[PDB]
Amino acid sequence: GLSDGEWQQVLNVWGKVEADIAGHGQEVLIRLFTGHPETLEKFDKFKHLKTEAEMKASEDLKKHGTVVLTALGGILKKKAAHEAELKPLAQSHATKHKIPIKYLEFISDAIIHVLHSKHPGDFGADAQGAMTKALELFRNDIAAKYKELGFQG
Amino acid sequence: GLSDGEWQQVLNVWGKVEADIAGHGQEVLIRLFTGHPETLEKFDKFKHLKTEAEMKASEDLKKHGTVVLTALGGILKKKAAHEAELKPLAQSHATKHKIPIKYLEFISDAIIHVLHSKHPGDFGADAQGAMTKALELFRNDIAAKYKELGFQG
Numbered sequence: 001g002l003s004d005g006e007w008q009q010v011l012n013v014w015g016k017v018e019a020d021i022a023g024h025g026q027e028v029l030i031r032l033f034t035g036h037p038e039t040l041e042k043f044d045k046f047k048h049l050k051t052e053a054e055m056k057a058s059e060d061l062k063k064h065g066t067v068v069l070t071a072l073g074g075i076l077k078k079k080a081a082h083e084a085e086l087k088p089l090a091q092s093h094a095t096k097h098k099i100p101i102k103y104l105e106f107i108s109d110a111i112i113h114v115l116h117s118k119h120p121g122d123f124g125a126d127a128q129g130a131m132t133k134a135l136e137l138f139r140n141d142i143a144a145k146y147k148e149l150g151f152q153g
Numbered sequence: 154g155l156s157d158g159e160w161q162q163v164l165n166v167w168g169k170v171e172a173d174i175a176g177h178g179q180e181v182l183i184r185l186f187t188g189h190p191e192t193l194e195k196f197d198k199f200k201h202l203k204t205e206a207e208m209k210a211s212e213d214l215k216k217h218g219t220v221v222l223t224a225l226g227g228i229l230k231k232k233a234a235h236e237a238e239l240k241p242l243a244q245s246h247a248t249k250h251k252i253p254i255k256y257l258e259f260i261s262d263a264i265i266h267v268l269h270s271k272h273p274g275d276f277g278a279d280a281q282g283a284m285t286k287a288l289e290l291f292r293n294d295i296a297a298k299y300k301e302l303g304f305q306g
């Protein structure tokens with residue numbers, strides 16, 4: 001994974017990308033298509049482009065570069081935000097508190113029971129299934145961090 | 154993963170949690186500690202809590218319940234946000250465009266190349282290492298979505 005400073009470096013350079021996203025998007029697709037020409041074959045609108053000059057002149061290639069880097073930027077920012085809250089919790093629960101995954105299963109059972117008890121009108125079979133899935137994603141994400149840290153859990 | 158309706162059900166019941174986070178947190182921890190007493194042994198600062206009555210009377214058990222459910226709520230919301238960034242991209246790139254992970258590796262290397270070319274002063278070795286790791290997490294997260302959608306990328 002990334003450290004806190006590494007995530008901040010990713011966010012910082014993406015700010016520079018966004019200040020000329022058209023130029024960055026063009027240069028990324030030109031590098032991809034010149035380095036790996038087979039990738040051009042996926043693009044009906046671009047597969048005729050041979051030279052860097054032709055690729056630079058394509059309004060459609062420039063538009064697509066912006067779409068790609070916008071989508072990737074959103075994924076990186078949301079990943080960084082999730083990591084910033086998940087990482088410290090996995091770190092403390094692995095290294096200081098030493099909490100096995102089975103204990104996270106026990107507290108997940110308690111959360112599901114309490115929500116069902118308190119809010120049956122907002123916690124029918126489907127909503128309970130949804131929360132069961134959400135807490136399993138949470139436990140699996142902690143377990144993945146545990147494996148990286150070498151903690152058996 | 155969860156459907157959009159399933160995430161809505163999770164966030165709807167979490168709104169009820171947030172209306173009394175301390176009460177929900179207390180009830181979750183007392184359910185956990187009464188059902189699985191070995192879990193209470195992990196809390197050195199609750200060594201004075203033996204009985205259900207003592208647990209209900211504890212200021213700090215209730216405060217800890219708030220800490221736990223506040224942290225969990227934040228992680229669930231940030232997970233949902235990142236899932237929502239990945240979903241449309243994994244959908245189209247698995248089912249319509251059929252983009253192999255090797256091609257995602259090629260475009261990741263193109264992004265690193267363009268950032269090194271454009272920002273050598275602000276994309277040194279460490280910042281490049283950070284972005285290399287972030288793009289690998291992106292590819293791995295898409296590969297996991299590919300497997301869920303039944304696409305061999």
Ligand code: HEM
Nearest residue numbers: 039042043067068071072241242245246250252256257260
């Ligand atoms: C960082 C990696 C990538 C990102 C963020 C990305 C993002 C996007 C986005 C947002 C779209 C438009 C909406 C959609 O169809 O999902 C798109 C379309 C597309 N992508 Fe990607 N993509 C990436 C990598 C690739 C690669 C490596 C290829 C092929 C080698 C590829 C091929 C396509 C194709 C063929 C389309 C449809 C183009 C069109 O009909 O206009 N993508 N991509």
Ligand code: HEM
Nearest residue numbers: 088089092097099103104107192195196198220221224225
């Ligand atoms: C939904 C699951 C959980 C969440 C969100 C959670 C969250 C937290 C948070 C935010 C803290 C304070 C900051 C920190 O040290 O990381 C904490 C502390 C702690 N957690 Fe957890 N926790 C969870 C499950 C558990 C379980 C199941 C146990 C034990 C069986 C446990 C044992 C502890 C202990 C011993 C501390 C230190 C308490 C203190 O002395 O103040 N956690 N937890």
Ligand SMILES: [O]
Nearest residue numbers: 064065067068
């Ligand atoms: O793309």
Ligand SMILES: [O]
Nearest residue numbers: 217218220221
């Ligand atoms: O906790």
